[PDB]
Design an enzyme around this catalytic site. Structure first.
Site, PDB file in Angstrom:
ATOM      1  N   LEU A   1      -9.975  -7.379   8.518  1.00 26.73           N
ATOM      2  CA  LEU A   1     -10.314  -6.724   9.791  1.00 26.73           C
ATOM      3  C   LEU A   1     -11.606  -5.902   9.721  1.00 26.73           C
TER       4      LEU A   1
ATOM      5  N   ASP B   1      10.958 -32.212  -2.688  1.00 26.68           N
ATOM      6  CA  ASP B   1      10.384 -31.309  -3.699  1.00 26.68           C
ATOM      7  C   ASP B   1      11.075 -31.447  -5.047  1.00 26.68           C
TER       8      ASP B   1
ATOM      9  N   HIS C   1       2.973 -27.706  -7.161  1.00 24.77           N
ATOM     10  CA  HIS C   1       2.230 -27.272  -5.958  1.00 24.77           C
ATOM     11  C   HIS C   1       1.950 -25.784  -6.121  1.00 24.77           C
TER      12      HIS C   1
ATOM     13  N   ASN D   1       6.299 -17.050  -5.340  1.00 23.50           N
ATOM     14  CA  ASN D   1       7.682 -17.267  -5.769  1.00 23.50           C
ATOM     15  C   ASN D   1       8.116 -16.215  -6.774  1.00 23.50           C
TER      16      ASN D   1
ATOM     17  N   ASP E   1      -8.924  -6.125   4.322  1.00 23.41           N
ATOM     18  CA  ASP E   1      -7.739  -6.339   5.181  1.00 23.41           C
ATOM     19  C   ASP E   1      -7.951  -7.472   6.200  1.00 23.41           C
TER      20      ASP E   1
ATOM     21  N   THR F   1       6.894 -22.233  -2.294  1.00 22.14           N
ATOM     22  CA  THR F   1       8.090 -22.366  -1.475  1.00 22.14           C
ATOM     23  C   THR F   1       8.351 -21.167  -0.596  1.00 22.14           C
TER      24      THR F   1
ATOM     25  N   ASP G   1      11.456 -29.564   1.931  1.00 21.23           N
ATOM     26  CA  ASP G   1      10.672 -28.976   0.871  1.00 21.23           C
ATOM     27  C   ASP G   1       9.783 -30.025   0.176  1.00 21.23           C
TER      28      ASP G   1
HETATM   29  C1  LIG Z   1      -1.857 -10.533  10.731  1.00 25.58           C
HETATM   30  O1  LIG Z   1      -0.895 -10.024  11.658  1.00 25.58           O
HETATM   31  C2  LIG Z   1      -0.339  -8.764  11.339  1.00 25.58           C
HETATM   32  C3  LIG Z   1       0.749  -8.348  12.329  1.00 25.58           C
HETATM   33  O2  LIG Z   1       0.181  -8.025  13.600  1.00 25.58           O
HETATM   34  C4  LIG Z   1      -1.426  -7.686  11.227  1.00 25.58           C
HETATM   35  O3  LIG Z   1      -0.829  -6.610  10.530  1.00 25.58           O
HETATM   36  C5  LIG Z   1      -0.694  -5.394  11.274  1.00 25.58           C
HETATM   37  O4  LIG Z   1      -1.935  -4.686  11.328  1.00 25.58           O
HETATM   38  C6  LIG Z   1      -1.954  -3.312  11.716  1.00 25.58           C
HETATM   39  C7  LIG Z   1      -3.297  -2.684  11.276  1.00 25.58           C
HETATM   40  O5  LIG Z   1      -3.606  -2.893   9.882  1.00 25.58           O
HETATM   41  C8  LIG Z   1      -0.766  -2.497  11.149  1.00 25.58           C
HETATM   42  O6  LIG Z   1      -0.671  -1.308  11.910  1.00 25.58           O
HETATM   43  C9  LIG Z   1      -0.370  -0.148  11.086  1.00 25.58           C
HETATM   44  O7  LIG Z   1       1.040   0.086  11.063  1.00 25.58           O
HETATM   45  C10 LIG Z   1       1.522   1.268  10.441  1.00 25.58           C
HETATM   46  C11 LIG Z   1       3.054   1.282  10.534  1.00 25.58           C
HETATM   47  O8  LIG Z   1       3.510   0.138   9.839  1.00 25.58           O
HETATM   48  C12 LIG Z   1       4.954  -0.050   9.754  1.00 25.58           C
HETATM   49  O9  LIG Z   1       5.584  -0.515  10.958  1.00 25.58           O
HETATM   50  C13 LIG Z   1       5.393  -1.887  11.358  1.00 25.58           C
HETATM   51  C14 LIG Z   1       6.118  -2.185  12.696  1.00 25.58           C
HETATM   52  O10 LIG Z   1       7.477  -2.593  12.612  1.00 25.58           O
HETATM   53  C15 LIG Z   1       5.732  -2.851  10.197  1.00 25.58           C
HETATM   54  O11 LIG Z   1       5.430  -4.199  10.490  1.00 25.58           O
HETATM   55  C16 LIG Z   1       4.985  -2.468   8.914  1.00 25.58           C
HETATM   56  O12 LIG Z   1       5.335  -3.406   7.898  1.00 25.58           O
HETATM   57  C17 LIG Z   1       4.487  -3.338   6.721  1.00 25.58           C
HETATM   58  O13 LIG Z   1       4.953  -2.461   5.687  1.00 25.58           O
HETATM   59  C18 LIG Z   1       6.217  -2.799   5.104  1.00 25.58           C
HETATM   60  C19 LIG Z   1       6.565  -1.813   3.993  1.00 25.58           C
HETATM   61  O14 LIG Z   1       5.959  -0.569   4.252  1.00 25.58           O
HETATM   62  C20 LIG Z   1       6.228  -4.234   4.549  1.00 25.58           C
HETATM   63  O15 LIG Z   1       7.544  -4.643   4.219  1.00 25.58           O
HETATM   64  C21 LIG Z   1       5.595  -5.253   5.517  1.00 25.58           C
HETATM   65  O16 LIG Z   1       5.392  -6.472   4.822  1.00 25.58           O
HETATM   66  C22 LIG Z   1       4.271  -4.744   6.127  1.00 25.58           C
HETATM   67  O17 LIG Z   1       3.278  -4.683   5.106  1.00 25.58           O
HETATM   68  C23 LIG Z   1       1.964  -5.144   5.503  1.00 25.58           C
HETATM   69  O18 LIG Z   1       1.224  -4.244   6.360  1.00 25.58           O
HETATM   70  C24 LIG Z   1       0.860  -2.973   5.782  1.00 25.58           C
HETATM   71  C25 LIG Z   1       0.124  -2.079   6.797  1.00 25.58           C
HETATM   72  O19 LIG Z   1       1.023  -1.618   7.791  1.00 25.58           O
HETATM   73  C26 LIG Z   1       0.072  -3.163   4.469  1.00 25.58           C
HETATM   74  O20 LIG Z   1      -0.180  -1.909   3.865  1.00 25.58           O
HETATM   75  C27 LIG Z   1       0.816  -4.126   3.506  1.00 25.58           C
HETATM   76  O21 LIG Z   1       0.050  -4.468   2.377  1.00 25.58           O
HETATM   77  C28 LIG Z   1       1.195  -5.439   4.205  1.00 25.58           C
HETATM   78  O22 LIG Z   1       0.000  -6.157   4.451  1.00 25.58           O
HETATM   79  C29 LIG Z   1       5.252  -0.988   8.557  1.00 25.58           C
HETATM   80  O23 LIG Z   1       6.562  -0.833   8.028  1.00 25.58           O
HETATM   81  C30 LIG Z   1       0.863   2.493  11.092  1.00 25.58           C
HETATM   82  O24 LIG Z   1       1.359   3.648  10.458  1.00 25.58           O
HETATM   83  C31 LIG Z   1      -0.682   2.409  11.025  1.00 25.58           C
HETATM   84  O25 LIG Z   1      -1.305   3.521  11.689  1.00 25.58           O
HETATM   85  C32 LIG Z   1      -2.389   4.210  10.965  1.00 25.58           C
HETATM   86  O26 LIG Z   1      -3.707   3.869  11.415  1.00 25.58           O
HETATM   87  C33 LIG Z   1      -3.875   4.165  12.807  1.00 25.58           C
HETATM   88  C34 LIG Z   1      -5.080   3.462  13.438  1.00 25.58           C
HETATM   89  O27 LIG Z   1      -4.661   2.941  14.681  1.00 25.58           O
HETATM   90  C35 LIG Z   1      -3.876   5.685  13.050  1.00 25.58           C
HETATM   91  O28 LIG Z   1      -3.873   5.965  14.439  1.00 25.58           O
HETATM   92  C36 LIG Z   1      -2.646   6.352  12.415  1.00 25.58           C
HETATM   93  O29 LIG Z   1      -2.913   7.738  12.304  1.00 25.58           O
HETATM   94  C37 LIG Z   1      -2.233   5.756  11.044  1.00 25.58           C
HETATM   95  O30 LIG Z   1      -2.960   6.411  10.008  1.00 25.58           O
HETATM   96  C38 LIG Z   1      -2.091   7.255   9.199  1.00 25.58           C
HETATM   97  O31 LIG Z   1      -1.495   6.568   8.095  1.00 25.58           O
HETATM   98  C39 LIG Z   1      -2.417   6.132   7.090  1.00 25.58           C
HETATM   99  C40 LIG Z   1      -1.693   5.278   6.041  1.00 25.58           C
HETATM  100  O32 LIG Z   1      -0.823   6.065   5.252  1.00 25.58           O
HETATM  101  C41 LIG Z   1      -3.181   7.338   6.503  1.00 25.58           C
HETATM  102  O33 LIG Z   1      -4.142   6.917   5.556  1.00 25.58           O
HETATM  103  C42 LIG Z   1      -3.852   8.161   7.619  1.00 25.58           C
HETATM  104  O34 LIG Z   1      -4.534   9.288   7.083  1.00 25.58           O
HETATM  105  C43 LIG Z   1      -2.826   8.522   8.712  1.00 25.58           C
HETATM  106  O35 LIG Z   1      -1.876   9.462   8.238  1.00 25.58           O
HETATM  107  C44 LIG Z   1      -1.167   1.058  11.608  1.00 25.58           C
HETATM  108  O36 LIG Z   1      -1.110   1.048  13.024  1.00 25.58           O
HETATM  109  C45 LIG Z   1       0.575  -3.253  11.174  1.00 25.58           C
HETATM  110  O37 LIG Z   1       1.578  -2.552  10.455  1.00 25.58           O
HETATM  111  C46 LIG Z   1       0.424  -4.628  10.540  1.00 25.58           C
HETATM  112  N1  LIG Z   1       1.690  -5.364  10.594  1.00 25.58           N
HETATM  113  C47 LIG Z   1       2.185  -6.161   9.642  1.00 25.58           C
HETATM  114  C48 LIG Z   1       3.519  -6.842   9.909  1.00 25.58           C
HETATM  115  O38 LIG Z   1       1.621  -6.367   8.567  1.00 25.58           O
HETATM  116  C49 LIG Z   1      -2.575  -8.172  10.377  1.00 25.58           C
HETATM  117  O39 LIG Z   1      -3.633  -7.248  10.498  1.00 25.58           O
HETATM  118  C50 LIG Z   1      -3.039  -9.586  10.753  1.00 25.58           C
HETATM  119  N2  LIG Z   1      -4.041 -10.033   9.790  1.00 25.58           N
HETATM  120  C51 LIG Z   1      -5.233 -10.464  10.244  1.00 25.58           C
HETATM  121  C52 LIG Z   1      -6.226 -10.903   9.216  1.00 25.58           C
HETATM  122  O40 LIG Z   1      -5.524 -10.521  11.449  1.00 25.58           O
HETATM  123 CA   LIG Z   2       8.839 -25.545  -2.472  1.00 24.14          CA
HETATM  124 CA   LIG Z   3     -11.496  -3.936   6.927  1.00 24.08          CA
HETATM  125 CL   LIG Z   4       3.990 -17.481  -7.625  1.00 21.89          CL
HETATM  126 ZN   LIG Z   5       8.627 -27.014  -5.611  1.00 19.53          ZN
END
Ligand SMILES: *[C@@H]1O[C@H](CO)[C@@H](O[C@@H]2O[C@H](CO)[C@@H](O[C@@H]3O[C@H](CO[C@H]4O[C@H](CO)[C@@H](O)[C@H](O[C@H]5O[C@H](CO)[C@@H](O)[C@H](O)[C@@H]5O[C@H]5O[C@H](CO)[C@@H](O)[C@H](O)[C@@H]5O)[C@@H]4O)[C@@H](O)[C@H](O[C@H]4O[C@H](CO)[C@@H](O)[C@H](O)[C@@H]4O[C@H]4O[C@H](CO)[C@@H](O)[C@H](O)[C@@H]4O)[C@@H]3O)[C@H](O)[C@H]2NC(C)=O)[C@H](O)[C@H]1NC(C)=O
Ligand SMILES: [Ca+2]
Ligand SMILES: [Ca+2]
Ligand SMILES: [Cl-]
Ligand SMILES: [Zn+2]
Ligand SMILES: CN(C)c1cc(C(=O)N2C[C@@H]3CN(C(=O)c4ccc5[nH]nnc5c4)C[C@H]3C2)cc(OCC2CCOCC2)n1
Ligand code: NA
Ligand code: NA
Length: 805
Positions: free
Chosen positions: A689, A261, A420, A180, A687, A159, A121
């Site tokens: 993207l 740290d 930090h 944090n 996002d 952290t 750390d």
């Molecule tokens: C960095 O890398 C990551 C990882 O690859 C990239 O993130 C991925 O991007 C995808 C596109 O944005 C996204 O795919 C979506 O997933 C939906 C299902 O998601 C759940 O399942 C996965 C799989 O296990 C899981 O990882 C998810 O986890 C998120 O949510 C939980 C809590 O809910 C959190 O604990 C977790 O931290 C994580 O949150 C993060 O991601 C979500 C988005 O999923 C953000 O909202 C958060 O802020 C946070 O950033 C989930 O538990 C799936 O349902 C989506 O499908 C919709 O869109 C498609 C288009 O293909 C469509 O066909 C469908 O119909 C559907 O639309 C419907 O739902 C809409 C929403 O309600 C609605 O408006 C419509 O009308 C429809 O009804 C979609 O495929 C993927 O989940 C994330 N993965 C992660 C881990 O974040 C990221 O993009 C990269 N970043 C860069 C800059 O490159």
């Molecule tokens: Ca730290």
């Molecule tokens: Ca976008």
């Molecule tokens: Cl913080």
């Molecule tokens: Zn520290």
């Protein structure tokens, strides 16, 4: 409730967790108040300390001792780590010369080299040089293995966000651990360092390495250690786990150190009190390596020495107070310190206004030490917006400073001398990476890289398939002797049209004018060759970008530039041009000042129009290929085609014009020619993207011309600057930016001055990786080079930082 009246006999540091109210004996039980009554007695022995002395050699096994020096200790797997040194005339690992480890040398029964992740750390990158005299073990790992001069953390450089990024390869916005300290409005729940809420699985997104291993049938050591378990006991526990029989033995292990740290916060990064914690960490490394050598595992295990973030000098007197700026400070909640996050104190308050808070915080004092942003306006390189846990209002705090709500917060919470959390490009925040073992390269330096890339490599080291993450798999192949992952280029999804002349001038009614009715067959075949692509090898050096989504677009050739023009967005997705060192800059002739020309290769229906810009009182326009850099007065007319035009706020045209008129030529003269690719970005839902059409929130008034959120440029040249950009025989050099397309220049406090005093500083803040632009555009660049694909992947993850040495 835990019925803590069972026993840990034979269960010390058990690998599977047991479910309440049965009492626990795992390395986390303390943190849950759940250990069996005899946990300390049986599992945390301390008798006689941690080292063998001469007189303990051959001793009769006394079970009360912390570790053993009896004859049976090697096969019991529980000798003190210095046992063979003291009692069998062996040398310490650090005193052996290093010998290349060409192949894993493992005891029979080992199916793969185990991985040990040693995380420290707050271990600032410069400690490797500045503390080298007191860290001989760490220095041997570093010089004999593979090392980077530093590794970049993620923002905020706190952290938990960085430890969980290390575990998942995800940005904090995606894994959910965005600080944090957090408030989640959907859960209506708060996460903090101290307390129980942080144990709830709902905070923690993505799929961390220990879950990835487990699902794929690779066994994992439990990664987390209760704070009171001493370092010496962690090491001995790992060593004991490594003596388990084959079917029970983990393949992956974690050690975590709270130092340096902990001390750095009290004494500052280079306080004289810092030497001791560095010595002590090095001693722990020595204990691990001597223990591995005893087990004959020192040429079998891959060891990663890695930090979460650095440490900067920060004191209480360097605190800005929001109460010195805001009238209604009691109507806000601030998450304070080395970053700031602001939300309304009460959701029932409809008098709360983010616009006025931002305005009250913007450039108010001559050398204000923080800058407010709406989160969607933060530099895209920070990837810090797409999470409901990230408050709309963000403060980026200057290095060495803190922000607080009111002065009373500092003295009713100087203690600290270090902290930090700052922007992750800041030198003091950078941290360390060393890889040592059979799978890592021997005595090899590699360029700095970001910590989001490590998860993929940890998966490669263990033969695992990584869960989807933000690393770019293959970009760290050059760290590895073997187990490389050989990526393929993505397939182009949309093929371009190549339109020829198809429209007469009078078919266009765009409300544009140009003074160009000025008239020779020597040069008429010439203009034709240029429109068919004769100079394309000059301006498109690395192949055309590939379009990785379904869309309709045209390749358009010109003497000086080539473009991929989108019939859907009505503007180029990309414009590519090369500027040699010898190129000259000219002005826009007076008669051509407002000239816009129909493009007779592109239908009126798929064209922008000048009337919309005239009617739109807020919006003006610019050009992607700059008229200033035209190769001849005749080539210049091409730069005024309606197909080279893009919407630009007047305020933004100040930035863009200065970049095009002054900076491109400056780069070309410094880098010996540059190839430039510029274009628009649409990210209305922040996002990171590419937006689809139906996500666009703003159009040029009265039209279907979408307004970009950002403009990018990618500027490439030869790494060996003795070769010109357009004749380079080897590795490339790149820098890129993603500039936000804003209607004001409030972000730059000096913007009332000449562009030469503020524009380049703005561009530097908004430096980007090619990979960031790929995500934001759905394009794939560098498709046709003479370079290996892994090398190109490395180039695409490069970030030009503009921090000195
Ligand atoms: C960095 O890398 C990551 C990882 O690859 C990239 O993130 C991925 O991007 C995808 C596109 O944005 C996204 O795919 C979506 O997933 C939906 C299902 O998601 C759940 O399942 C996965 C799989 O296990 C899981 O990882 C998810 O986890 C998120 O949510 C939980 C809590 O809910 C959190 O604990 C977790 O931290 C994580 O949150 C993060 O991601 C979500 C988005 O999923 C953000 O909202 C958060 O802020 C946070 O950033 C989930 O538990 C799936 O349902 C989506 O499908 C919709 O869109 C498609 C288009 O293909 C469509 O066909 C469908 O119909 C559907 O639309 C419907 O739902 C809409 C929403 O309600 C609605 O408006 C419509 O009308 C429809 O009804 C979609 O495929 C993927 O989940 C994330 N993965 C992660 C881990 O974040 C990221 O993009 C990269 N970043 C860069 C800059 O490159
Ligand atoms: Ca730290
Ligand atoms: Ca976008
Ligand atoms: Cl913080
Ligand atoms: Zn520290
Ligand atoms: C819960 N997280 C994820 C996770 C957790 C751990 C882990 O046991 N602890 C125990 C420590 C207690 N603690 C502070 O008291 C603390 C320390 C420094 C601070 N500065 N400012 N405030 C601070 C508060 C920090 C906590 C991390 C270790 C790990 O390792 C993850 C590995 C993933 C693979 O790469 C290497 C690290 N992950
Ligand atoms: Na206008
Ligand atoms: Na300004």
């Amino acid at each position: 409730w835990t019925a803590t009246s069972g026993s840990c006999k034979g269960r010390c540091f058990e690998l599977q967790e047991v479910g309440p109210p049965d009492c626990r004996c795992d390395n986390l039980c303390k943190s849950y108040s759940s250990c069996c009554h005899d946990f300390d007695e049986l599992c945390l022995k301390t008798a006689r300390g941690w080292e063998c002395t001469k007189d303990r050699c051959g001793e009769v096994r006394n079970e009360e001792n912390a570790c053993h020096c009896s004859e049976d200790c090697l096969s019991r797997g529980d000798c003190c780590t210095n046992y063979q040194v003291v009692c069998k005339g062996e040398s310490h690992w650090v005193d052996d010369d290093c010998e290349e480890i060409k192949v894993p040398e493992c005891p029979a029964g080992f199916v793969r080299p185990p991985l040990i992740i040693f995380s420290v750390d707050g271990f600032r990158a410069s400690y490797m040089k500045k503390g080298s005299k007191v860290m001989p073990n760490i220095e041997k790992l570093r010089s004999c293995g593979t090392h980077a001069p530093y590794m970049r953390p993620v923002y905020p450089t706190k952290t938990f966000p960085n430890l969980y990024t290390l575990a998942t390869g995800l940005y904090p916005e995606s894994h959910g651990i965005v600080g944090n300290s957090m408030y989640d409005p959907v859960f209506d729940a708060s996460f903090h360092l101290r307390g129980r809420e942080k144990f709830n699985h709902r905070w923690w997104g993505g799929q961390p390495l220990w879950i990835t291993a487990t699902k794929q049938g690779v066994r994992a050591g439990t990664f987390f250690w209760s704070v009171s378990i001493p370092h010496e006991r962690r090491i001995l526990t790992i060593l004991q786990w490594l003596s388990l029989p084959d079917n029970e033995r983990p393949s992956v292990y974690a050690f975590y150190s709270e130092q340096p740290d902990f001390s750095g916060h009290k004494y500052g990064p280079f306080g004289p009190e810092m030497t001791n914690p560095l010595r002590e960490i090095d001693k722990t490394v020595g204990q691990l390596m001597d223990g591995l050598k005893q087990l004959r595992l020192h040429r079998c295990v891959n060891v990663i020495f890695v930090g979460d973030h650095g440490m900067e000098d920060v004191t209480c007197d360097r605190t800005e107070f929001l109460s010195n700026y805001l009238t209604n400070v009691d109507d806000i909640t601030l998450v304070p310190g080395t970053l700031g996050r602001i939300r309304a104190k009460s959701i029932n308050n409809s008098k709360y206004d983010p616009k006025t808070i931002i305005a009250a915080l913007t450039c108010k004092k001559p050398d204000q030490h923080f800058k407010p942003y709406m989160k969607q306006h933060l530099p895209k390189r920070l990837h810090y917006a797409n999470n409901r846990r990230i408050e709309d209002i963000h403060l980026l705090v200057d290095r060495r400073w803190h922000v607080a709500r009111k002065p009373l917060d500092v003295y009713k919470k100087c203690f600290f001398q270090g902290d930090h959390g700052f922007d992750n490009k800041v030198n003091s925040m950078q941290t360390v990476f060393v890889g040592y073992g059979p799978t890592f390269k021997y005595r090899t330096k590699v360029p700095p890289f970001e910590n989001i890339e490590l998860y993929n490599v940890m998966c490669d080291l263990l033969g695992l398939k990584p869960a989807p993450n933000n690393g770019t798999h293959g970009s760290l192949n050059h760290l590895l002797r073997t187990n490389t992952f050989r990526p393929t280029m993505p397939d182009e999804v949309s093929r371009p049209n190549y339109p020829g002349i198809m429209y007469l001038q009078s078919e266009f009614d765009l409300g544009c004018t140009c003074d160009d009715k000025v008239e020779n067959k020597l040069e008429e075949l010439n203009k034709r060759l240029h429109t068919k692509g004769s100079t394309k090898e000059r301006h498109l050096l690395y192949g055309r970008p590939a379009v990785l989504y379904r869309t309709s677009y045209d390749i358009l050739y010109h003497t000086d530039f080539e473009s991929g023009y989108s019939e859907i967005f009505l503007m180029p997705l990309w414009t590519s041009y090369t500027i040699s060192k010898q190129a000259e800059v000219s002005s826009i002739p007076e008669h051509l000042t407002n000239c816009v020309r129909p493009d007779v290769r592109v239908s009126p229906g798929f064209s922008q129009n000048c009337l919309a810009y005239k009617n739109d009182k807020q919006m003006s326009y610019g050009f992607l290929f700059p008229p200033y850099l035209s190769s001849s007065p005749e080539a210049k007319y091409d730069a005024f085609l309606v197909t080279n035009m893009v919407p630009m706020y007047p305020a933004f045209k100040r930035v863009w014009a200065y970049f095009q008129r002054v900076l491109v030529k400056k780069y070309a003269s410094e880098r010996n020619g540059v190839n430039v690719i510029s274009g628009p970005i649409f990210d209305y839902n922040y996002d990171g993207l590419r937006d689809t059409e139906d996500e666009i929130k703003q159009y040029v008034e009265g039209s279907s011309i979408p307004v970009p959120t950002h403009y990018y440029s990618i500027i490439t040249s030869c790494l060996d600057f003795t070769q010109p950009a357009d004749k380079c025989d080897g590795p490339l050099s790149v820098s890129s930016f993603i500039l936000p397309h804003r209607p004001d220049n409030d972000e730059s406090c000096n913007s009332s001055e000449d562009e030469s005093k503020w524009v380049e500083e703005l561009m530097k803040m908004h430096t980007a990786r090619v990979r960031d632009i790929e995500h934001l555009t759905g394009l794939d660049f560098y498709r046709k080079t003479s370079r290996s694909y892994s090398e190109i992947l490395t180039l695409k993850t490069y970030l030009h930082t503009y921090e000195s040495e």
